[PDB]
Every structure is written in structure tokens, then in C-alpha cells.
A paper describes a structure:
Species D (HAdV-D) are the most diverse species and cause both gastrointestinal tract infections and epidemic keratoconjunctivitis (EKC). Sialic acid (SA) usage has been proposed as a major mechanism of cell infection for EKC causing HAdV-D. Here, we provide apo state crystal structures for fiber knob proteins of 7 previously undetermined HAdV-D, and provide crystal structures of HAdV-D25, HAdV-D29 and HAdV-D53 knob proteins bound to SA.
We performed X-ray crystallography to generate structures of species D human adenovirus fiber knob proteins HAdV-D15, D24, D29, D30, D32 and D53 in their apo states. These structures show the expected trimeric form, all viewed down towards the apical domain of the fiber knob proteins ([Fig fig1]). Adenovirus fiber knob proteins crystallised readily, under widely varying pH conditions. Non-significant changes in transduction were observed when cells were transduced with viruses with the fiber-knob proteins of HAdV-D15, D24 and D29 ([Fig fig3]). There was an overall trend in reduction, although in BT-20 cells there was a small, non-significant, increase in transduction of HAdV-D29 fiber-knob protein virus following treatment with neuraminidase.
Numbering used by the authors:
A (entry chain A), C (entry chain B): 178 to 367
B (entry chain C): 179 to 367
Write the structure that this text describes.
């Protein structure tokens, strides 16, 4: 079938913000022909970001988290991605031999919608179209906003990329990084 | 693919304060492992049909909760805010007057959105079963209202979808009429 | 195949805000049965909005953009739409400009979800449900917000319409109108 590429709904820790498996990234990608429908949430279970305190840790580095998914020409997740390979595969509809996927180019962000940028800016080429910008809410609390920026194909060192950038502006005291669910879509490569 | 909905223009089908005082337009479409949803709420009778927070300034006068409660078969339970008058599958090639096993495919996943026990465990998310954003009353940018959609957090039901609307501004003669809000969630199967 | 109607993912200039072909609208509409899944972004490549300066150009008309898509009873784009029809077509295995489509009623916003309003507004009839109201971010920068209002079927002289209204409040100084990607959905006519 191959219409869902995901972490499953409840992965074990599968993401390295600071240390291996310090966080759980839940990511579902569903193919609806020419668009991928996504939903992402991030829970930090260990380390400074599992109990944010920006009085104790007041630097810019203490107020953001970047999760990078890097893919090769076959749409396979590359080593060096923030998310590890423990939970990343097609949803199975039958229980016959389980193998890592070899091809998911149909799940990749379009290279023509979201080309790689060169650093001489030109007014003819968008700098925004490959970004989705909004807020998520830590603990699902309205008074704990966190900006999310999802960027497509902006990593120079991979064929495709999906990057989730989380940055908060408020000084949080003893707040676990735990983002409310964020729904999004993008144009598929094929 | 398959759609469970109120239709696009239900008659009043919701009880905020009194029977059929409001119209909830709710469309759920199954797309693989996800449900794609859109919701809007119009209050046609009662205090919330003409919000006036000078006359009604209490906290209870500045929020609306719409609860959809479902049983183990994905059937809408009577105590839901929305009544069963407009809640059925979109007419296909074939017709059918009841939902049951097919309804569980529209329910929010219990694995994605598990119930929480006593004092919460820091290894289990509190946030992932919530979508938090803004809608705009009358579709007017200067009339924001927070929306929080919560999945499966109602203790006495197998599944739930709850739409919480809460505003901070003091609205004067503003009908509760929310701009359309799009969302998605992980399906039970 | 007839599940995606789009601008192509990388359109040449296709929009007249002020002058012919001053802007590139990227718009993808994908049919998922009863709902259309959309994503929109707008880059202005010529004219004042290609380098917004609201100190130089301080008036209300200098702080908003309207893109109108007007459709006939067949779902075909009408003359007087902001966008050109040449590259507005179904996605197929043919990636080149081709014969215009004849019918796309299945992509049109529902007349029952989004009826035209009669002059006496009525508390029984929603004024909001045919609108999606949010923010997009110029250049993908959280400090450059822009309101977006998408309105369905509100243009009096057309069978269907999708209108994208962009309006900003900040005094931008030398900021290209370049909107971050905005994801939305609406109820299909059939």
C-alpha cells in the first residue's frame, strides 16, 4: 500500500537533541497523491529541555530545538539525522517479513517546489515558499507558545530534507518541552 | 476517501445552553492513517448568539465547549453536545442508515492519544492529544478566539473529540460564528 | 489523472497584482473525496510589493494584496481573475503546458457549505464559515507577520470563487512580499 510513512503513533525515544534517545519525535506522513499530509509533535524526556528553565539557562541556545530529517536520493533517512532509524518505516497492513524501506521518493518534498538556495538572493526566487511558520503550545497550554518553522530541502548536505525548528521567546521555568500536535502539508517530489 | 459528517449545511444540531441553539458543521475524511477534519460553529439562539461581555462578563460567558463522546463502536453517545440529527456517512455508490465497525476507523487513536493515569509520567506527552490555534469570530481578524481540540481526554467515553473555544477580548454584540478550522489526527485503524 | 489541480509547483509569473506578470502564485488543490486540500504561497517579483516600503508608501492600499480566482459553472477560471490560466491545469504524467481543462466542478468550493449571502444578514446563516483566517510570514520570518483571509464563493458575479486576501499592519522597510506556505482545506461542491 505504502501511503503512510511514520514513526508509529507512540515511538519509544528515537531522537537526539543533546544525547541519544533524549526525546520522542512522533511524525506521520500520509501521501494524498501530489501532497503529503503531515503531523509532528516532540516530547523531550531527558536533559535540560525535559525541564526548560530559562532563568537557570538564559542563552539563545537554551531557547530552541532543531530536528533535522535528511534523506538520500531514494528517500531513505540518512545517518546524521536528529531522528534515529528505530521508528521510521511504512505502516504495515499485513504481518509478513518486516524490512527497512528502500524507496520513498513519493514522500520527499518536491525539488522544484522547494529548490536548494544559492546565497546571492534574487527577487525572482522565493525565500519563504519552502517554510511553514506558526506556533505550537508547550504542554498544550495557551500561555506557553513556541514558534515552529518547518523547512523543506534547505539542508545542502542531503538530496531532500525536512527540518522542524522550535524556538520560544518567553522565559519558561520548569516546563518540559512537549509540543502540541502540528498539522501541515507539502508538495510531493512524485 | 470515506467521509463521516454533519453534511455541509446541517439544521441546528447542537446544545450549548438549550436544545438546537447552535449549528456545528463537522467533516471527517479518512486519508490512509489520518482523519482530515474541518469544524465551524454558529450559535443561533441564547447569550452566545449575541456575545456581550459587558452585560455577561464572567469567565463562563467567554468560552464554549463542544464535546463529541463515542462508545467502543465509534457511535456518538447521547450526552454529546452535538445531537445525532446530522451525523452519517456521505452518500456513496451504495447507501446505509447505521454506522458501527466502520465508525472505529474515524475515531482518534488510543495509541496516539492514550488516557493519562494519576500523577503524570514525564515520559508520556501531555500535549500531543491537543491542537491549539485561533479562529476568528465572524471571520474578522480583530475578533480572535482560541480553539483547543482535545482527543480521547473524556474519562467516561472510549473516544472523544472536544472543541474548546475561549476568547480574551470583551466582545459587544458579536454572534459566536467561528471561521472554518482545518485539522487532522491519527485514526484508531 | 484528475486528483490535483495546480499552478505547477514552480510557476513562471502568473499573476497581475498591479502589472501583468508581477507575481508568482503557487497554488495546489488536491481532492480527498469530500474535501479539497490546498497550499498557497505568493511571491511578488515586480513593483512596490516586490520591495515593500511603508515609510515611502504608507497608505492602506500599500499594505494589502488581493488575489481573486473566479470560476464559471464548469469550474474554469474566468477572465478578470488575478491569475492567468495558461499553466493552471490538472497534474498528469504530461509535465508540459497542455489543452485547458473543461470541467473541475469537483474542485470548486461547495455552494451548500459556502452559499452567497442575501442583503439582510440573518443570525441563522453563518458569515464566518466561508472564511479561513490566519497569519503567514513574509520571508518565512516570525517578525514579519501578514494576515491571510481565504474566502469561498463570496464574489457576486461568478459561480464559484477562491479569494486570497493578504494584509499587514507593520511598517515594513524594504521587505519583498514573499509569503510562507499556507495549508488549508475546504468542502468540495461534489
Amino acid at each position: 500500500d505504502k501511503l503512510t510513512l511514520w514513526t508509529t503513533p507512540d515511538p519509544s525515544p528515537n531522537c537526539k537533541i543533546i544525547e541519544d534517545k533524549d526525546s520522542k519525535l512522533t511524525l506521520i506522513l500520509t501521501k494524498c497523491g501530489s501532497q503529503i499530509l503531515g503531523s509532528v509533535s516532540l516530547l523531550v524526556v531527558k536533559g535540560k529541555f525535559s525541564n526548560i528553565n530559562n532563568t537557570t539557562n538564559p542563552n539563545e541556545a537554551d531557547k530552541q530545538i532543531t530536528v533535522k530529517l535528511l534523506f538520500d536520493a531514494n528517500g531513505v533517512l540518512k545517518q546524521g539525522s536528529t531522528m534515529d532509524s528505530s521508528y521510521w518505516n511504512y505502516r504495515s497492513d499485513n504481518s509478513n517479513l518486516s524490512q527497512p524501506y528502500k524507496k520513498a521518493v513519493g514522500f520527499m518534498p518536491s525539488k522544484t517546489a522547494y529548490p536548494k538556495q544559492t546565497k546571492p538572493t534574487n527577487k525572482e526566487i522565493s525565500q519563504a515558499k519552502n517554510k511553514i511558520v506558526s506556533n505550537v503550545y508547550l504542554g498544550g497550554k495557551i500561555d506557553q507558545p513556541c514558534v515552529i518553522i518547518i523547512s523543506f530541502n534547505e539542508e545542502a548536505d542531503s538530496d531532500y530534507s525536512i527540518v522542524f525548528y522550535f524556538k520560544w521567546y518567553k522565559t519558561y521555568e520548569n516546563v518540559q518541552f512537549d509540543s502540541s500536535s502540528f498539522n501541515f502539508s507539502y508538495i510531493a517530489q512524485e
